[PDB]
Symmetry: C2
Subunit: 814 residues, 2 copies
């Protein structure tokens, strides 16, 4: 008998959610339809009837709890202790407060659909309970003494969230009201009703691409946490900035970025101490039914990927919704892990102004047509339960009418109205840091020569690309800058060149040489820090995270590195919707750096190109800086200029692979100490040697590693009639420097743009059209030397690659 009871307890805890009354529409009738002497028997010693009543109340009323999939027993125990108790009914005051939030939420919706045209698509009607729910989340975060709640959400109810959650005045929200308002960021202050705390509340900008903002929000919150010295990189472990992420049911189940972002939730490089997720589950996706949208019971099942607790709650019960919101915040604070709230509700209107939703979902909309709103339902229920008197209900309807008038009236009143050069001692310090190992640290035998070579380079020169990068980042840290660098295998470097983190051969302990530069020789901190991580195997979420990190902390140097530039197309949505366009669309600024290894080396179409042509196509005046440096010193100056220029603008860098180890691609100490970034470079024989520019009749214009091959062919054949000029900064085109450089070769009769990439790729598609237009006296007659146009970045054969490369060199010198 006691064995059947234990199995019955487990059955309610595991599967009671399959029988909970969570759907306000009750669309599926089969949901519910599909001994007595044992009830008074005692089984802590409690009667079976009391055990069963606690289980039905906790798991089979208006909240479906999914938590037995959680692997941590202490988390399962924490939930079952809070859920399996006799809960004290809310005070009438708390019920009246929740009703006032529904009053404000519904008053906003009535106004939005009555005053303006084309607002049906944004309607929160049938889902208004999300407002007292969000209110409870933020109020509970303030109760925990947290610093800020950052929200990311799509368009549904966004202006309602601005007014009733962020607390933006109507004068600001409806100022010159057309749709861009549905994409902009916002900031406000939430002041507790029944408490004495306040908390900052912000909303991040986003495109119409559903869920694409998810990893952006995480990076933004992480940057804010790092600044407050809270969380993973902080002294305190309160993670005092809370991500509050809203979603729609169809998008949450279908978009891959959701799983990529959930995958970041506990990573040392990306954790934000747990995100509070709210899915506005109106059980429809435009005209699409959930059966065509997902292959699982709930739209939230993806959250089981990280063992997150899931609460399915009935949107027509705002008390249960507010209670679950507060429980979610307490779980997040206790375990620093994500909590998912699935609010079952409905979409009162069609998807947009034209849509009659009974055309495609007649059964659902015949049931929706019998529904009174959550506010009228909650007021009527409170009257029935004997919770409020007829007078108190009339006062509630008066408060609703007052809110409605206030928004109409207020909107009516609104209608009436630099050097980057460092001293040599900085280079020496960064070099010495590579040999300043912790006491008893055991360096891997193959890493030790790298550390010694770096000390040698810092004092004697011949500085390679990999060290030049760390000299730039280390000098920024010494000057007080926060530097965050990440990507796939970025700590060591894909080409075993970086070693930003070195690993103890015996203990596995990590040592970060550049972190020593965060402390001055006197011992005081510089205010700077080096944060370097290996990312998860993701492009979409990792790029979105780094973009959001730079938005969150504009003073940080933020770099994301692709394993090979060819994989960055996995993050195309972030490049198109945020990086390249966020500034022009929303006035949102980012200084994020994307490092994209690029170059034709015969390793195939997925290990050759960062798609220079695509980034040049996205570019417009002042949107991004695009570069392909050919020397370590120039890369050093490019990064230091980027971090010190006081301009928040993304930087795209096409970085080398084999050129990392090209013995000709090295720089002198004086290039770091007495020079600056050069958008255009000339051959050293003309700037520092005995070369004669006046002998040149053929000018080769190029970018990147092909320069060294062209220079080696020029040297082999003693071709004084040919000069090679490098365009280091591809965008904005350095018009003036390019004009000035070309003027010093007066006997040029022919000019060629030379590139490794196919004719429909690389810089030619844009340069071939732009250069003869911006500089007609220099580039009229400009011809191309490249690989033939191809549907792939390169051939799949290393043999075909070598022949094509030799054809380019032979044509250039033909």
């Amino acid at each position: 008998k006691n064995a059947r009871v234990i199995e019955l307890i487990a059955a309610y805890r595991n599967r009671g959610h399959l029988m909970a009354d969570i759907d306000p529409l009750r669309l599926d009738n089969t949901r519910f339809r599909s001994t007595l002497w044992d009830l008074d028997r005692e089984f802590q010693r409690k009667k079976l009837r009391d055990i069963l009543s606690v289980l039905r109340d906790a798991y089979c009323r208006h909240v479906g709890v999914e938590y037995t999939h959680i692997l941590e027993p202490e988390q399962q125990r924490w939930i079952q202790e809070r859920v399996e108790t006799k809960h004290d009914k809310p005070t009438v005051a708390e019920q009246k407060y929740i009703l006032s939030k529904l009053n404000a939420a519904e008053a906003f919706e009535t106004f939005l659909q009555t005053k303006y045209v084309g607002q049906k698509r944004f309607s929160l009607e049938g889902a208004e309970t999300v407002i007292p729910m969000m209110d409870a989340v933020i109020d509970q975060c303030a109760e925990h003494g947290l610093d800020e709640v950052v929200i990311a959400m799509p368009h549904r109810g966004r202006l309602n969230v601005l007014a009733n959650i962020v607390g933006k005045p109507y004068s600001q929200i409806f100022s010159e009201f057309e749709d861009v308002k549905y994409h902009l960021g916002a900031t406000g202050t939430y002041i507790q009703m029944f408490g004495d705390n306040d908390i900052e509340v912000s909303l991040t900008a986003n495109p119409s691409h559903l869920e694409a903002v998810d990893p952006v929000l995480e990076g933004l919150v992480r940057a804010k946490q790092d600044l407050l010295d809270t969380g993973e990189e902080g002294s305190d472990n309160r993670f005092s900035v809370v991500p509050l992420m809203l979603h729609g049911d169809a998008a949450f189940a279908g978009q891959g970025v959701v799983a990529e972002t959930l995958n970041l939730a506990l990573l040392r490089g990306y954790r934000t101490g747990g995100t509070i997720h709210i899915v506005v589950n109106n059980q429809i996706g435009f005209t699409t039914a959930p059966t065509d949208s997902r292959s699982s019971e709930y739209c939230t099942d993806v959250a089981k990927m990280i063992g997150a607790p899931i609460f399915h709650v009935n949107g027509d019960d705002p008390e249960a919704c507010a209670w679950v919101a507060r429980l979610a915040v307490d779980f997040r604070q206790a375990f620093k892990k994500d909590v998912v709230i699935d609010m079952l509700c409905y979409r009162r209107r069609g998807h947009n102004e034209g849509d009659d939703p009974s055309m495609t979902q007649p059964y659902m909309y015949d049931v929706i047509d019998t529904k009174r709103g959550s506010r009228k339902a909650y007021t009527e229920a409170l009257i029935g339960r004997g919770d409020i008197s007829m007078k108190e209900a009339e006062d509630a309807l008066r408060d609703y009418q007052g809110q409605l008038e206030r928004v109409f009236n207020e909107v009516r009143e609104l209608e009436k109205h630099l050097a980057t050069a460092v001293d040599k001692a900085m280079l020496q310090r960064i070099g010495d840091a590579h040999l300043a190992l912790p006491e008893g640290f055991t360096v891997h035998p193959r890493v030790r020569p790298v550390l010694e070579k770096r000390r040698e380079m810092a004092y004697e020169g011949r500085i390679d690309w990999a060290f030049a990068e760390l000299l730039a980042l280390g000098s920024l840290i010494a000057e007080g800058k926060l530097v965050r660098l990440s990507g796939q295998d970025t700590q060591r470097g894909t080409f075993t060149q970086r070693h930003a983190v070195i690993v103890d051969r015996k203990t596995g302990e990590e040592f970060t040489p550049l972190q020593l530069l965060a402390t001055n020789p006197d011992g005081t901190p510089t205010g700077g820090k080096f944060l370097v991580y290996n990312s998860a195997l993701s492009e979409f979420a990792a790029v979105g995270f780094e973009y959001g990190y730079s938005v969150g902390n504009p003073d940080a140097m933020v770099l994301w590195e692709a394993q090979f530039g060819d994989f960055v197309n996995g993050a195309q949505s972030i490049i198109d919707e945020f990086i390249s366009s966020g500034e022009a669309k929303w006035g949102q600024l980012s200084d994020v750096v994307l490092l994209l290894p690029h170059g034709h080396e015969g390793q195939g179409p997925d290990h050759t190109s960062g798609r220079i042509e695509r980034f040049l196509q996205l570019w417009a005046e002042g949107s991004m800086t695009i570069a392909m440096p050919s020397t370590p010193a120039n890369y050093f100056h490019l990064l230091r200029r980027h971090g010190k220029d006081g301009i928040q603008r993304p930087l795209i860098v096409f970085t080398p692979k084999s050129m990392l180890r090209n013995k000709a691609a090295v720089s002198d100490i004086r290039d770091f100490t007495e020079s600056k970034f050069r958008s255009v470079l000339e051959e050293p024989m003309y700037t520092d040697g005995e070369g004669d520019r006046n002998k040149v009749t053929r000018l080769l214009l190029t970018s990147g590693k092909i320069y060294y091959e062209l220079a080696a062919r020029k040297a082999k054949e003693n071709r004084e009639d040919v000069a090679i000029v490098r365009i280091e900064q591809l965008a904005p085109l350095p018009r003036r420097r390019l004009a000035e450089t070309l003027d010093r070769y007066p006997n040029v009769k022919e000019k060629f743009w030379v590139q490794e990439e196919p004719a429909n790729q690389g810089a030619w598609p844009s340069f071939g059209l732009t250069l003869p237009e911006i500089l007609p006296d220099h580039f009229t007659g400009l011809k191309r030397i490249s690989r033939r146009a191809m549907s792939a970045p390169s051939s799949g054969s290393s043999k075909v690659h070598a022949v094509e490369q030799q054809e380019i060199l032979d044509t250039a010198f033909g």
Copy 2:
């Protein structure tokens, strides 16, 4: 109290025994790890506990209590909680012969060639007898084919020891081999059945092939009349998908693809997943690659059973592979096998993996391979004699010599028009409702207007599309059309499926064209679905479907072309380049709603400039038709041309309801696709081509606005020529048309898109070089260059649009 502790103990093993199972061959985590003769309800507690420890805490970690279906939990419980009969000596020797072949292959690959370390299967060889068991069990069920998708690790070993490709084929001109497709036949060793085994092509982008494989299998399943769109529920084409641990946890496409597993439009009857879990991703440790216990935790999204298996136990690995196939057959749902193993070598030739993972590699350095381990284990247990072990080693040696010798020996050596009757039949089909069907009051006028357009003309875009698809079905073609809200259409224009107002039953008017008037089938079919809210998986699936059935007409529709960038990896790695890279052909159609209408930067552009940039001769067809009839002929040409080539179409939004954008019946019955269109006043009216001094070249809906301005101002001096086919550029038709306007003094390319977008970036550079006698001096009229596809303000949009029209006629 005693019995109560026993039930709680049974539940703990079933729920959490996998946390204590000896699954890791390396045993990296050390922290991982009397009353018993009393009978319980009748078995002794010691025998109850032994069954539980063997089932859940030995070399297999079973995760199944998260499954919501109780019959699935029961089915697993019953097969895993039994005293299992030890495999026959013939089976153990067979598993060892597969490990022998697998290891001999690896020794050869790493000894003969340079640069093969990155693809080494050393430490993970047990995946070969595991895959062998999967395919053998599929053959035992009498299934038709197993289609594999995998990344590069052990790919050539799979070709030789699974697909059964000869060494002469594998090492011919020997890295493109690591990406190509392959087909073979698997013949059972101890059975009398055979099964086809194929491998699909893939880029280096890990997991990107996942939805491609599902689409390819579904196309094959539809062809064999099996599964969702078939007579039997066998789903006799099985997807076998391999993965790496870091990519399976980090790539979003995995979740998007798992999300398709039970959908009516995308289900393949369950996929068998094998994760080669070597507990590393290049230099990255699992604690930096995922936020959960297992790399396979994403599979809990669809309640899939998960089996964590020790790669050093090939018997347990082969047993789990067979159980997985039985589960898939019983429940038509995905099964995930997490094979714990190790990566013996560095990620590549340069890598000393102890630089970044010294503890793991000091433990790997003590490991003998799973072959030497399994041979020694078979001697110790007394399952094979010393002689049989020597023969087993003689078999390895013999397999090694054979591959060296065979590769050594290798080194030495049409009209698209339809008739009036066809148009009328498609119009009439819209009114041929099933008995007792109740049409929605707002859908009924659409059905009656279509009958009216079929007989009287003024055919709009939406009907012209269905006229093209419907006529192809009547001719016997399989038409598969899908995308977000595609059944109704995003702009409420398609109504390819209509819903009974009273019962909710779906009716597909075009499906009536799959049956001849005599009652016999045409062989054609209309498969139309609302997709999940995915771009990456949905586009990958449709691409895969076109590969799987080259005779099918496959169309994927973006809600707005602006969202197709979510599928950029599929566009770049498969659609635009699969033919040139792997010789893999696809006739997939992408329909991208496009046009400047003031709805913002995410509801304006399908990024024409990006598709034109990807294009190279013979890779794709790119079009932006301006008339319903020209769109009809474009789709008909595409489906009937006998060429497998992707088609990119920039489709209208407001132009769907533009009263001037309608076609006559004669445009369907007596014309063809026109790559270049002239104004009807010159081809059919009283317009004089010799009066023209200014030529406006354009594409798409802006034509109607330019024509309206011409008509308002009676501008006989200006002509508007449309480029309907943007790629390949219709060079001969363009020259021929322009030669008909001899007094042209100036030419302009006119477009709605910003100067750095639309067709201008490519046309501005390409038109003066391919046709210098016509386009030298070509000038642009467009929106200014922008970092976004458009302004976010409808007011700015209107001003800019008027500026374009005023410049064109200035």
